[PDB]
């Protein structure tokens, strides 16, 4: 709401002026942030997943959905079904809240950061923020929780080109 306000106030005009869009409808907006855990160890011990769900619920403030495997793979020792990884899709005000916390509180708790990596865009307009550890997120309390697991954070933009998306993510605050 703090960030979505800033977006509607003094990002849309500035960004529409920068690219010279015909209508305000063309202006890139953030549709959904999708966090993904990817607990492949769960195949052995299911209890490790229960924690990986609970820890993630606190980060998003929105219980995740336990993703089940697609095809059987002997290499990883995996078989059709069986719970592996947890998804959670953030939209609306509660999404901007997370994005704000991500750029304002979260990211500076990593040893360092280069910034908005040009390589880390899919070439369609969407960004994927590689998160090393779970202890970066202030709601987690790593002193209580066992394994670090990790995390995958996808920002799906309405942008057509990385250039447009890059400017949007930048002015929203992302390094």
């Amino acid at each position: 709401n703090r960030l979505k306000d800033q977006y509607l106030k003094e990002i849309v005009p500035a960004l529409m002026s920068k690219f010279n869009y015909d209508s305000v409808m063309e202006v890139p907006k953030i549709d959904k942030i999708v966090i993904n855990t990817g607990v492949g160890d769960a195949t052995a011990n299911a209890k490790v997943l229960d924690s990986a769900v609970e820890e993630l619920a606190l980060i998003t403030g929105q219980k995740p959905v336990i993703t089940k495997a697609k095809n059987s793979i002997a290499g990883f020792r995996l078989r059709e079904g069986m719970p592996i990884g947890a998804k959670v899709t953030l939209r609306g005000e509660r999404m901007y809240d997370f994005l704000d916390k991500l750029v304002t509180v979260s990211l500076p708790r990593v040893r360092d950061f280069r910034g908005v990596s040009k390589k880390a865009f899919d070439g369609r307009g969407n960004y994927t923020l590689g998160v090393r550890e779970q202890l970066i997120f202030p709601e987690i309390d790593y002193d209580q929780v066992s394994k670090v697991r990790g995390m995958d954070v996808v920002i799906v933009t309405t942008a057509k080109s990385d250039e447009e998306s890059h400017e949007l993510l930048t002015q929203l605050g992302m390094p």
Partner: protein, 118 residues
């Protein structure tokens, strides 16, 4: 990312409904088209491909509603009436691909309350 065309996927569902349901000169199809603003009804013959008694929200006759559901009940009331004037009773309800729930339900419930059998 691409926005889903709500009417495209709606029309896809409508096909699934029309698979079972088709109008006859004896028992025509009461088809319902719903917009963001207003709602529209047509009692159709598929064998002839001709629209008998029809009614909409924007029609000059009955143009007073509080909610869209209430508006949609007035349409059911009027399309039922216009059907009875034409001399037809037994219809089959074509959801149009809409969930038989809010407005489209309130159209049927209304029409069914008047002289239309389904």
């Amino acid at each position: 990312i691409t926005k889903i065309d709500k009417n495209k996927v709606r029309k896809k569902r409508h096909a699934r409904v029309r698979s079972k349901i088709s109008g006859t000169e004896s028992r025509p199809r009461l088809n319902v088209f719903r917009s963001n603003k207003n709602i529209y009804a047509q009692i159709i013959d598929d064998v002839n491909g001709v629209t008998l008694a029809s009614a909409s929200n924007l029609d000059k006759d009955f143009g007073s509603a509080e909610s869209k559901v209430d508006a949609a009940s007035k349409v059911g009331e009027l399309v039922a009436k216009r059907a009875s004037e034409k001399g037809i009773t037994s219809v089959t309800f074509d959801r149009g691909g809409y969930l038989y729930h809010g407005r489209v339900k309130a159209l049927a419930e209304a029409a069914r309350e008047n002289g239309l059998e389904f």
